[PDB]
Every structure is written in structure tokens, then in C-alpha cells.
């Protein structure tokens, strides 16, 4: 028994075929079953033929006879079919409304999540259907990680490097840091965890959580976690106020935060507010400062990643009483300078999925482009606040959608919050970049921020761009462009100063070749989001939808404090770089 995800109508019927078993009222259960392949129907029992060794599970071919379900064949003299009168049989038959359309629910219940148009629906549908989609997608995502075969240690060539043997008759996952494994050791009658790991082509390169002397027989699987059903919406209902509510502003603020005094007051005058922070516009400065502006205010700082939550803690550690902070951790090595798991503490820094049920004066959700609607509904479920602030930049990278292959995902579709910022604008905007030379700012200002991003720094005169297609080899699930790494080898010799630079590319295999040949440190664009370096050497590697995505391109070039070389495959972005052009040697 539960609530029809379409009507809210009370009902005893869940679709069995749906991987998430939504409650469907007699009306909506029927409209669903007769318009799709989904025909299994669960109640206080499962609508299946109780007859001995009959296989009938379709509800359009079944009948209640006595108190037991039968198909045409086995039914007793006296029965009625489970499925007629535009309705499927179960409790609460007289309270049951229906819906004009069920089209969106069928699409969501049935889509394989490989087309972008799927995720577009999950983010424009009714809010109840945004929750059902969020679950159905996340459960599809965790199911797909099972389709992958087991990796097993066949030899230990060295430390940091291994020989893996793979389970037969199953696909092998990509070996980049978007695929985190879990290890296992072969015990008398079962198996025990031995840390989380990632792998990269060599033999394979493994970067484990802990260290060990892991030996042959030890194996690896992408550990999947049960997706709990969702209840809270992705956003609370918005309220706009005429005075600051529930918060007491400080009378003396420092000049370090004086620029955010207006925006912090806005936060006090609406239920939730959205802050776009472009690269190095000072989001965490904003987040921590809000505390000092509302000194008595209880604030729970959250993001999806440990990394994100830890950076909030690192800034907190500068400005806020340590004795007033606490980091929440469930039973990976994060920040460890705050008393651990003290929920009643004034400032609580915690990932989404480890949040405790609790209230708070303000909730700050950071790095909001990386959040799914699923995370969005967890935060609303776990934290009842007077005020919610969503901080991020819908021009930076979303969560990877492992299943997605047909179409690109536009920022207005990353989650409900980024939909808002792209369709009615963001409530607040950090509009001065402190990090990058002006050439890089001028470029992303135009590219993705409507000429509203302003450069604190001057031109560096150290931002260069080369058009060089080079040669694109492909391996198992990445790209390589050695001639582009070639160009950069040649550049470093004439420009030795740039031997301090980080190497950034949209591919881990490009990154691996580049480390061997240049011995620069490497980040993929995805792994660089959040970090800053003085000098950056970016090889686009390909002209793919991946390598040309304007959000990835935006994060790639905004890592530089001083100077950047961009070796470019794409004429389009090449032509949009406000950088000094260089000929090819
Ligand atoms: Zn219904
Ligand atoms: Zn279904
Ligand atoms: Zn039967």
C-alpha cells in the first residue's frame, strides 16, 4: 500500500516490471500496463497464477478465483479478471483519479537512459516524476555496474603495476578515475574488503585508497549501493520575504566579506537562493563569510564529493572557531581537524549521502553543477532549514552520466537547480575572476557567461594557442594525439620556463603518454575542476563532442593563474581563444 506516483491516489498496486516498483492506483496502473510491455503487477501479493507450475504473470490474462490469482486455464468457475473497466484490481478502488496523460511516466519507466532526451524529460516532468526518474536512473546506473566482469590479479609485476585477468562472457569497464573499483581477498568461506582502487593502462597502473602487498587471487568490482526511494522534492517551494527572516546580521563585518553583504542579505529574504561562482570568483570565501555575517546561525555545509566538503572545511579552518565545527563521516581519507560526527555542532560539514536527519538556520550546498536531482531530494529529505543556498557554476562540469551516448547534456538539464539558473538566471553572481590572466577571462566571459565575467588580473601576455590536428590513435576507451605531445615537447625546449606547468587533456590515455614523454604532472579536465596552477599546457587531442564541450573547455583553460598553451584540434574553439597565435615548427 502507498501513493500513485501520477495521482497520489492511495493504492495497493506497484508495477513489478518497473525496476523501482512505483505505487500505481487502479486507474494509472492500468493506463501503464496496457500502453507498455510492463504487465507484472504487485500488491499485498504478486498478481501471478497461484496454480501449480503455471508461468502466467501478464495481469491482462489473470483472474481472482476465491482469494488466489489464476490465468484463463486454471481459473475456478467463479472468478473476475484482475484487469478490466479501465482499472486493475486492488484496495482503495473508489478513491482513484487517473491522469490526462501517462506518456512521461511510460517514457521514464521504459527508457534505457542512453539518449540525452531521457534526462531532458527527467528534468522537465512533474516534480513527483523527477523523483521517480532520479531513482529509476540511479538504480539503472548501479545495475549496469554489475554487467561488467570481475577483474582478478594474475601476477604482481611490481608495486603500483599489475597483471589483471578478466571474467569471460562479460564486458570490461573503462580504466579511468570515473571507474573506482573495490578490492577483495579470498577467505576460507567468504571475502573481505581491501580498499577502493582505480586502474589505468600500462599490465595496468593501479592507484589504491590504502597501500598493501596485494597478491594473486585478489579481485576487483565497482561496488554498487542500494538506491533508497525518494520523498522530498528537488527544490522546496520558494518563498520571497520583505525583511531578513530567522537570521541576525553582524554589526561589524571585515572588508574581506564586505562585497558579499548585499548577497548575504538576499539569502536572508528567500527560502532558497542560487549563487553562480565562475572560476576563482570566491565561492568558498562567500560560503564561510555568510557564517560571520550571521554569527549565531547554525549552518550545515554539504556537497556530493568529500573533496568539495573538505575545501569548505579548509576555508572554515582559517575564519571560524574550530570548537564550533564538526566533520560528519560514515563508518577514503577526508579532512580530520574537526571533532568527528558531532551533529549538534554549530557548523556541520558533511557529504550529501552521509547527512544526518536534522534542522539548521542555513544549508549551503556547494559545487551544484556536480549534483543530480537524486542528491537534491536527499538534501531536502535529511535537512529542514529556514534558508537554502545552492553554490556552483552551471558552466562547469556535471556529474558523469555513464549510460549516456546519444545527444549532449545542456546545463539547464544537469539538475533542477541548474535548470533554474539557466532559465530565470542565478539569484547571485560572483563576477570578478581573481585567478586567471585577462586573455582567459575575456574568453570564458564571451564563451559561457554573457560578457558578465570581469578580470581582476591584467593580460599575462603568456596565453598562446596553436591549431594542430596531428594524429589521433584510439585505444580500448580513450584517445591519444602523440604529434600534439610532440609539438609540446618542442615548445618546452624553446620555453624551458614552462617545465613548471601542469598537462591537461580531455583523455587519460593522452595524459599517460604525455607524462612519459614530458614528465609534466597530468590532470584530465574532469579531475582538474577545483584546482589552480600557474601554467597549464592543454592538448585538445580530438575534435569530439567530448573534447569540444564548452563546459569542459571552460574548466580546462580557467585552471591557469599566469600562462597557458592551448594546442587545439577544433577551428571553432581555436578561433574563440583570445590568445596569441603561434605557427608550427
Ligand atoms: Zn494514480
Ligand atoms: Zn512499469
Ligand atoms: Zn496458470
How would you concisely characterize the structure shown here?
By secondary structure, the protein is of the alpha/beta class. It has 16 helices and 31 strands. Zn(2+) 13 binds at residues 49, 54, 71, 74.
User: Could you tell me which ligands this complex binds, including any ions or cofactors?
Assistant: zinc ion
CATH architecture classification name of the domain at 433-581: 3-Layer(aba) Sandwich
Whole-Å distance between the termini? Answer: 72 Å
Helix content range: 25-40%
- Widest beta sheet: strand line-up: 17-16-18-15-19-20-14-21
| DSSP summary, beta strand count | 31
**Radius of gyration, taken over Cα atoms and rounded to an integer in Å:** 27 Å
Structural class based on helices, strands and sheet pairing: alpha/beta
| Shape, principal axes of CA atoms | globular
Task: Report the sheet-strand fraction.
Answer: 15-25%
Question: What would you call the quaternary organization?
Answer: monomer
Q: What would CATH call the homologous superfamily of the domain at 433-581?
A: P-loop containing nucleotide triphosphate hydrolases
At the fold tier of CATH, the topology name of the domain at 433-581 is Rossmann fold
Binding site for a ribonucleoside 5'-triphosphate: 277-284
Domain (+)RNA virus helicase C-terminal: 431-585
Catalytic activity: ATP + H2O = ADP + phosphate + H(+)
Binding site for Zn(2+) 13: 49, 54, 71, 74
Amino acid at each position: 500500500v502507498g501513493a500513485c506516483v501520477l495521482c497520489n491516489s492511495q493504492t495497493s498496486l506497484r508495477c513489478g516490471a518497473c525496476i523501482r516498483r512505483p505505487f500505481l492506483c487502479c486507474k494509472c496502473c492500468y493506463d501503464h500496463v496496457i500502453s507498455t510491455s510492463h504487465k507484472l503487477v504487485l500488491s499485498v501479493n504478486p498478481y501471478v497464477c497461484n496454480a501449480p507450475g503455471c508461468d502466467v504473470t501478464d495481469v491482462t490474462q489473470l483472474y481472482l478465483g476465491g482469494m488466489s490469482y489464476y490465468c484463463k486455464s486454471h481459473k475456478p468457475p467463479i472468478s473476475f479478471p484482475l484487469c478490466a473497466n479501465g482499472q486493475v484490481f486492488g484496495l482503495y478502488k473508489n478513491t482513484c483519479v487517473g491522469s490526462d496523460n501517462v506518456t512521461d511516466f511510460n517514457a521514464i519507466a521504459t527508457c534505457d537512459w542512453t539518449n540525452a532526451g531521457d534526462y531532458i524529460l527527467a528534468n522537465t516532468c512533474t516534480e513527483r516524476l523527477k523523483l521517480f526518474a532520479a531513482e529509476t536512473l540511479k538504480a539503472t546506473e548501479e545495475t549496469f555496474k554489475l554487467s561488467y566482469g570481475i577483474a582478478t590479479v594474475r601476477e604482481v609485476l611490481s608495486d603500483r603495476e599489475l597483471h589483471l585477468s578478466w571474467e569471460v562472457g562479460k564486458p570490461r569497464p573503462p580504466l579511468n578515475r570515473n571507474y573506482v573499483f573495490t578490492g577483495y581477498r579470498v577467505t576460507k568461506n567468504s571475502k573481505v574488503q581491501i580498499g577502493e582502487y582505480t586502474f589505468e593502462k600500462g599490465a595496468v597502473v593501479y592507484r589504491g585508497t590504502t597501500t598493501y602487498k596485494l597478491n594473486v587471487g585478489d579481485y576487483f568490482v565497482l561496488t554498487s549501493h542500494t538506491v533508497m526511494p525518494l520523498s522530498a522534492p528537488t527544490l522546496v517551494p520558494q518563498e520571497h520575504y520583505v525583511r531578513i527572516t530567522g537570521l541576525y546580521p553582524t554589526l561589524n563585518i571585515s572588508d574581506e566579506f564586505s562585497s558579499n553583504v548585499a548577497n548575504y542579505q538576499k539569502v536572508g529574504m528567500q527560502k532558497y537562493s542560487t549563487l553562480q561562482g565562475p572560476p576563482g570568483t570566491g565561492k568558498s570565501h562567500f560560503a564561510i563569510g555568510l557564517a560571520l555575517y550571521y554569527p549565531s546561525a547554525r549552518i550545515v555545509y554539504t556537497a556530493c564529493s568529500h573533496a568539495a566538503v573538505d575545501a569548505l572545511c579548509e576555508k572554515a579552518l582559517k575564519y571560524l572557531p574550530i570548537d564550533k565545527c564538526s566533520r560528519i563521516i560514515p563508518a577514503v581519507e577526508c579532512f580530520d581537524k574537526f571533532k568527528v560526527n558531532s551533529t549538534l555542532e554549530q557548523y556541520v560539514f558533511c557529504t550529501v549521502n552521509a547527512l544526518p536527519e536534522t534542522t539548521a538556520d542555513i544549508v549551503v550546498f556547494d559545487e551544484i553543477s556536480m549534483a543530480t536531482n537524486y542528491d537534491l531530494s536527499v538534501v531536502n529529505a535529511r535537512l529542514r532549514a529556514k534558508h537554502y543556498v545552492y553554490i556552483g557554476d552551471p558552466a562547469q562540469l556535471p556529474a558523469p552520466r555513464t549510460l549516456l551516448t546519444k545527444g549532449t547534456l545542456e546545463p539547464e538539464y544537469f539538475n533542477s537547480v541548474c535548470r533554474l539558473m539557466k532559465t530565470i538566471g542565478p539569484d547571485m553572481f560572483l563576477g570578478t575572476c581573481r585567478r586567471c590572466p585577462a586573455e582567459i577571462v575575456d574568453t570564458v566571459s564571451a564563451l559561457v557567461y554573457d560578457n558578465k565575467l570581469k578580470a581582476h588580473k591584467d593580460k599575462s601576455a603568456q596565453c598562446f594557442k596553436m591549431f594542430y590536428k596531428g594524429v589521433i590513435t584510439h585505444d580500448v576507451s580513450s584517445a591519444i594525439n602523440r604529434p600534439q605531445i610532440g609539438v609540446v615537447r618542442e615548445f618546452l625546449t624553446r620555453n624551458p620556463a614552462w617545465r613548471k606547468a601542469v598537462f591537461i587533456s580531455p583523455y587519460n590515455s593522452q595524459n599517460a603518454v604525455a607524462s612519459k614523454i614530458l614528465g609534466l604532472p597530468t590532470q584530465t579536465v574532469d579531475s582538474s575542476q577545483g584546482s589552480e596552477y600557474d601554467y597549464v599546457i592543454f592538448t585538445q587531442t580530438t575534435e569530439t563532442a567530448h573534447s569540444c564541450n564548452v563546459n569542459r573547455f571552460n574548466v580546462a583553460i580557467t585552471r591557469a593563474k599566469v600562462g597557458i598553451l592551448c594546442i587545439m584540434s577544433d577551428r571553432d574553439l581555436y578561433d574563440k581563444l583570445q590568445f596569441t597565435s603561434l605557427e608550427i615548427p
